[PDB]
């Protein structure tokens, strides 16, 4: 009941609809703390086998702390604009370097592992304690001091309790202090769920985020922030989905050319506005780089930093490309090469020249042969399409597709006065150039 598709023969493009939106509009920052110990070199000049292992595990811990201390020391995608991804978390850490902000956090978390702390600038952030190495080292490892270990399971327990810090240090070291995909070492799944549960958002947003934690991880940041006194702190910057559950639709385009027998003398045309389209508030967000949108079943996650704001009239380009309300963007060329585009529920085949183009399924083999021009085939009884030397697999999603017939628009142009090398043109701009060229030729 969800996904449908339509192919337009006039323009050689297809539209997929039936998807739902989840657009990241803002950021949410939280502070994660780890309590450290102040172990100083002990004498304990033993020779036991377990003492040596304990010493090695303490050396690893101290080297990790030193390394962390050293870490902090004093088409159409060209129209988008550039932002700064981690500005908010960096601002939070810039605040945390102030005089009493670490003390405030330390004194507000001693009784509980979660709390809301008001910073000196008035902003209140979630602070959450994930690991307590101070307690296990000060007590139960240096009892008031275990200089001759009598149990082997002490070594194993200490090794288990130390892996988290080493893994975090490694991840921060190989990334210069900023890890885009937030690993389960930085935040476990239970901790991430507990953190989502405390955001001041609606229950619908919480349900959307709780069922897609793998996307939330993929769209998050972790920033190494500070390590002073006996506290390790880093900021986690989570996505905020301000717009959810609105209709979304994808556009696929392929070149459209004439089919003259002579090798040259052929003109081509292509729509350049392929991408994802979602309507949020009385307008449409357009994402030219469809690689920047994650898809889970019929839910699309897109980032507004990589979008343009367009009027709702843009949708008229699919129904009629010559409408006066909106000017559709195209590209003209003179090189006709065969290729294929795999859509949501089928494939578009532009087969030109002397290439051999076919569609097949596993049981019966070839079940269609394509002629020169642009054509479409549904995935209902087709498994693969082969264009020249290339073989493609079609998606096997369930849905209905519709074929719309019409005369290709490249036949309405006169090749004599047709512009060719136009990368960033449109319908009106091509018409103006054609009109000027045609009006010039009236000499007498």
């Amino acid at each position, epitope marked *: 009941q969800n996904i449908t598709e339509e192919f337009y023969q006039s323009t050689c493009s297809a539209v997929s609809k039936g998807y739902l939106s989840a657009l990241r509009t*803002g950021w949410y920052t939280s502070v994660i703390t780890i309590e450290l110990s102040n172990i100083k070199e002990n004498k304990c000049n033993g020779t036991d086998a377990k003492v040596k292992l304990i010493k090695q595990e303490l050396d690893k811990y101290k080297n990790a702390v030193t390394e962390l201390q050293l870490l902090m020391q004093s088409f159409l995608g060209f129209l988008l604009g550039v932002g700064s991804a981690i500005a908010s978390g960096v601002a939070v850490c810039k605040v945390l370097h102030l005089e009493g902000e670490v003390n405030k956090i330390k004194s507000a978390l001693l009784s509980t592992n979660k709390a*809301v702390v008001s910073l000196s600038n008035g902003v209140s952030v979630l602070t959450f304690k994930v690991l307590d190495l101070k307690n296990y080292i000060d007590k139960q490892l240096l009892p008031i001091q275990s200089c001759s270990i009598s149990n082997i399971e002490t070594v194993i327990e200490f090794q288990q309790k130390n892996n988290r810090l080493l893994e975090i240090t490694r991840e921060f070291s190989v990334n210069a202090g900023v890890t885009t995909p937030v690993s389960t070492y930085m935040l476990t799944n239970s901790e991430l769920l507990s953190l989502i549960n405390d955001m001041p958002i609606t*229950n*619908d947003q919480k349900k959307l985020m709780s069922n897609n934690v793998q996307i939330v991880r993929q769209q998050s940041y972790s920033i190494m922030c500070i390590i002073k006194e006996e506290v390790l702190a880093y900021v986690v910057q989570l996505p905020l989905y*301000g717009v959810i559950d*609105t209709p979304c639709w994808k556009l696929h385009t392929s070149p459209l050319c004439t089919t003259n027998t002579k090798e040259g003398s052929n003109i081509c045309l292509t729509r350049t506005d392929r991408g994802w389209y979602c309507d949020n508030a009385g307008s449409v967000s357009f994402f030219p780089q469809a690689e920047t949108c994650k898809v889970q079943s019929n839910r699309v996650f897109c980032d507004t930093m990589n979008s343009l704001t367009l009027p709702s009239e843009v949708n008229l380009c699919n129904v009629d490309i010559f409408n006066p309300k909106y000017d559709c963007k195209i590209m003209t060329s003179k090189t006709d090469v065969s290729s294929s585009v795999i859509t949501s529920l089928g494939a578009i085949v532009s087969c030109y020249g002397k290439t051999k183009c076919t569609a097949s399924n596993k049981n019966r083999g070839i079940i269609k042969t394509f002629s020169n021009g642009c054509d479409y085939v549904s995935n209902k009884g087709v498994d693969t399409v082969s264009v020249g030397n290339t073989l493609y697999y079609v998606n096997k999603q369930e849905g209905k597709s519709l074929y719309v017939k019409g005369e290709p628009i490249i036949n309405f142009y006169d090749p004599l006065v047709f512009p060719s090398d136009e990368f960033d043109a449109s319908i009106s701009q091509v018409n103006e150039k054609i009109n000027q060229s045609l009006a010039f030729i009236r000499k007498s």
Partner: antibody
Amino acid sequence: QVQLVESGGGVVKPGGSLRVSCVVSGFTFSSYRMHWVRQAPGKGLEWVSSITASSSYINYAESVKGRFTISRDNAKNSLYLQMNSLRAEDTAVYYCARDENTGISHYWFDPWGQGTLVTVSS
Amino acid sequence: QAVVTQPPSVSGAPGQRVIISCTGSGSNLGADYGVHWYQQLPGTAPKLLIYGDRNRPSGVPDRFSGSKSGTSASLAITGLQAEDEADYYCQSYDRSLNWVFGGGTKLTVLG
């Protein structure tokens, strides 16, 4: 100009059924969450039910769970409330309202309808 | 989980300044959810007076202002007139009860 027009109110006996409707115009109906709010005669306001732009998430008040059902039709720009097993305390004026929000903390109802009175009397 | 409380009634004299208060708990206003105010006339429908704790839509005569802090919010009216006799509501969001509304405060002007 944005307009929300409610209809379908009337008298009914306890344990009966009724269906109210609200037709909107002046904005994209499919980009917004919609709500139902009722007010008893001489009493305060009470939120009833909400529905997201594509029917994915639905919420009810604890006093109407299991008896009311919210739905919408995006093609006709209308949303519906089906009331079943009516009780005496369901007498009130029912409003349809559009959701406004800032993404994180603020959520309010800026545009309201005119209301439709529903009376449950034996 | 929580509830929102409002003074049943308030009175004032023309030209004076009255204050309406809204008191929440740790699940509505202690959970960082904003407060919003609505004005209702004797036979009309509610209309928005203040959103975002302090914001005013286009058409409110700038005589209404609100503020929030902790689990308390207030609406202040200066220059009381005879057209201000109306019911006033505060609404927020709750973790368990979702959208919640105050009890309602009816303003009276003496004279």
